[PDB]
Amino acid sequence: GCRHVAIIMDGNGRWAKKQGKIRAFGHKAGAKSVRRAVSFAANNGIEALTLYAFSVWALDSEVKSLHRHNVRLRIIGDTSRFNSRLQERIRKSEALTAGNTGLTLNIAANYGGRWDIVQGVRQLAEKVQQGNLQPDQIDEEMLNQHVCMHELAPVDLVIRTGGEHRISNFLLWQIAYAELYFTDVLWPDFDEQDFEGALNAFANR
Amino acid sequence: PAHGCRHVAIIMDGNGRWAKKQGKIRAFGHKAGAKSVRRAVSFAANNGIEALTLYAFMELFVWALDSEVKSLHRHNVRLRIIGDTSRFNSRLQERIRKSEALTAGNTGLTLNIAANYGGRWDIVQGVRQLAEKVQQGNLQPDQIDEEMLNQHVCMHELAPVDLVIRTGGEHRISNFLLWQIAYAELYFTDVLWPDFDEQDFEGALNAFANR
Ligand SMILES: CCCCCCOc1cccc(CCCNC(=O)/C=C(\O)C(=O)O)c1
């Protein structure tokens, strides 16, 4: 069974252009597709769902709602430049939902897979400097403990919408053994049948 | 070159399944697969590719160097093995080193062979090297960025990987290159590796140019 799905949500801009409408309009139907995919994952017993915007201030309004649905919210990515009022909103949102036991929802914000690895490297380098760790002691498992989502089920399936066939520096370390699923369907149109189409692909491998 | 493609990497899968369909033992898939390796190398060499990296998917079948090294050298191909070679048995280590040494001055295709290679291990050995420089106080932790780690992973001095091909129908990287394929085109085909020919390769190059 599929435990942890990651989705690259591409196609909002193309979609808007197809409908002879501006970017703004695509983002908003995109947000609608986010809620449906979240709901579909929670109702189908997926443990973790990780979303990458490829094509945050709008998460204030959705948090109370996620909490009641027993959803644990996390933001992965570099939030250190972000102004400190938003940093503390993200912190409160995380804190509010952290004891929740349903779907863990990871939102990648200013995330890059290379950045993710490097930040973990930096941490082991600090340890080496301090005298706490020898070079030859560093192995896969220890680096794993310092990259994003090490406490979750490993990523089983990566879905990319919108037609491109690339990871584009989303998760790198984490997807060594994931099924990759590429669809031409643009993010605002990706619905429950597309999502199940992708879980199918994973079951057939 | 018109196709835009400097560095192709291939996951060469479907050899086992190819033999089974024929009603043949695995050994015949390995032979058929080895022929298709030679065909993909020649084709890469004649269509202007700078770099071709192969993931072959006891081990002493790997003494397939001595079958091919003279031939590669005669096609002007520069050979390099990537992966953890340290646990290999002394004479195998020397046949690799000599094979590499023999072809290092060649100016055609650079051909990389993954042997006991994994994408995670690759990243991990680059981090070791960096951790050494930290400890032998050359390096500040806060100086480590992407470009730096990038110079310590395999093949850092080659053109970045533009295109990954996997034959055999599965849609996964299986711990082949990870760091290096952040921005690569991924192309999956159901064609089994022994059947993958010039036209299929041409097929992949054109779709890359079109995308
Ligand atoms: C040029 C220097 C030598 C290159 C190193 C390897 O040399 C090879 C020799 C013969 C055949 C191949 C083709 C791939 C082996 N088959 C699989 O991995 C098949 C599966 O994983 C599967 O069938 O599921 C490669």
Side-chain angles (χ1 to χ4, degrees):
Chain A
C2 213
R3 311 171 67 210
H4 188 168
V5 177
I7 310 196
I8 302 166
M9 305 180 288
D10 192 8
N12 286 345
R14 190 173 306 253
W15 189 86
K17 192 262 184 143
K18 271 177 170 269
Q19 318 257 350
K21 295 281 170 193
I22 43 152
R23 271 133 74 159
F25 213 86
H27 305 150
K28 293 283 292 185
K32 303 189 211 133
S33 194
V34 171
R35 305 192 178 94
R36 164 172 67 200
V38 174
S39 174
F40 179 92
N43 294 164
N44 288 270
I46 288 176
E47 302 184 7
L49 184 58
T50 300
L51 307 178
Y52 192 50
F54 202 41
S55 70
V56 161
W57 38 92
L59 269 154
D60 266 297
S61 48
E62 287 306 296
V63 177
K64 283 267 222 140
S65 186
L66 298 172
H67 184 78
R68 289 185 303 247
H69 284 86
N70 202 21
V71 163
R72 179 171 66 197
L73 183 78
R74 306 163 121 163
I75 306 284
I76 59 186
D78 180 12
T79 53
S80 72
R81 214 194 176 212
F82 292 29
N83 62 80
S84 52
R85 169 161 166 276
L86 183 68
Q87 288 197 41
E88 178 65 42
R89 299 255 165 154
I90 287 164
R91 235 176 295 263
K92 294 192 83 258
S93 299
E94 293 193 318
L96 173 72
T97 58
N100 286 346
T101 43
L103 179 68
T104 295
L105 168 58
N106 301 299
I107 309 289
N110 199 35
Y111 176 88
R114 285 180 178 178
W115 169 83
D116 184 352
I117 288 152
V118 160
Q119 65 70 28
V121 177
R122 281 155 84 97
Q123 294 176 44
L124 297 189
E126 311 278 29
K127 274 174 95 164
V128 177
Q129 205 182 32
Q130 281 157 21
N132 303 133
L133 176 51
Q134 299 302 120
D136 59 4
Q137 296 184 304
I138 297 167
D139 64 356
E140 285 173 39
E141 191 56 62
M142 191 185 284
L143 182 58
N144 200 56
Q145 291 301 133
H146 301 72
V147 309
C148 293
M149 316 192 290
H150 56 280
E151 71 303 343
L152 310 172
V155 177
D156 284 314
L157 170 59
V158 184
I159 305 168
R160 184 165 172 152
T161 62
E164 295 294 311
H165 299 149
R166 289 180 189 193
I167 288 326
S168 292
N169 194 38
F170 189 30
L171 307 166
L172 291 169
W173 181 268
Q174 291 92 347
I175 64 168
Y177 296 103
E179 183 72 17
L180 316 170
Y181 184 91
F182 298 101
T183 186
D184 287 1
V185 172
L186 310 177
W187 180 249
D189 296 328
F190 176 97
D191 64 4
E192 299 90 341
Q193 192 160 346
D194 299 303
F195 207 155
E196 187 172 347
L199 297 173
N200 287 346
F202 162 88
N204 295 1
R205 256 164 219 64
Chain B
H3 55 65
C5 225
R6 297 168 76 192
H7 191 167
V8 180
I10 315 199
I11 296 172
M12 303 175 297
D13 194 15
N15 296 289
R17 180 175 25 248
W18 188 88
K20 164 167 196 193
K21 285 203 201 312
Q22 308 290 319
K24 290 196 164 49
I25 64 171
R26 219 172 148 106
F28 292 91
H30 297 157
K31 277 233 322 178
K35 293 184 178 193
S36 184
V37 169
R38 296 183 214 114
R39 181 169 58 191
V41 171
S42 276
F43 174 100
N46 302 137
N47 290 286
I49 286 175
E50 303 184 8
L52 175 62
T53 296
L54 303 174
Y55 196 55
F57 188 79
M58 256 290 254
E59 69 179 319
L60 302 140
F61 311 121
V62 64
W63 289 77
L65 306 168
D66 294 77
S67 287
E68 307 301 325
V69 174
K70 286 196 159 64
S71 182
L72 296 165
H73 176 73
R74 295 158 183 175
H75 285 55
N76 196 28
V77 167
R78 188 181 167 203
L79 179 54
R80 171 165 292 209
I81 284 36
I82 61 183
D84 193 357
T85 38
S86 52
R87 258 162 97 186
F88 296 170
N89 33 306
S90 269
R91 257 217 194 178
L92 167 58
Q93 288 197 46
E94 206 45 38
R95 301 269 173 173
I96 295 177
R97 219 155 282 278
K98 295 153 86 157
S99 298
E100 291 166 320
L102 170 66
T103 59
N106 303 345
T107 51
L109 168 94
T110 289
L111 172 66
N112 314 294
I113 308 297
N116 179 41
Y117 180 85
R120 287 189 176 180
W121 164 89
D122 190 357
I123 288 163
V124 156
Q125 65 69 38
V127 169
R128 284 174 180 144
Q129 296 187 47
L130 294 178
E132 295 282 354
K133 297 184 187 173
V134 174
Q135 182 174 78
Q136 288 140 213
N138 298 156
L139 185 50
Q140 295 320 100
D142 48 80
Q143 303 173 310
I144 296 156
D145 58 10
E146 280 177 35
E147 183 57 75
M148 187 178 291
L149 188 50
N150 195 58
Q151 304 283 120
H152 296 78
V153 312
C154 294
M155 309 194 291
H156 59 265
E157 77 290 10
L158 307 174
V161 174
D162 297 300
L163 169 67
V164 188
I165 303 161
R166 179 166 187 152
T167 57
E170 305 300 310
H171 288 228
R172 62 193 59 240
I173 290 317
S174 304
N175 204 27
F176 183 29
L177 310 169
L178 293 166
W179 182 274
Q180 305 91 328
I181 71 183
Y183 300 106
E185 180 82 6
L186 310 171
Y187 182 88
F188 301 103
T189 177
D190 291 345
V191 178
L192 304 187
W193 179 248
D195 300 318
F196 180 90
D197 55 17
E198 290 96 336
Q199 187 163 320
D200 295 301
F201 209 151
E202 195 186 337
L205 294 184
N206 287 347
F208 177 78
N210 288 310
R211 292 177 151 264

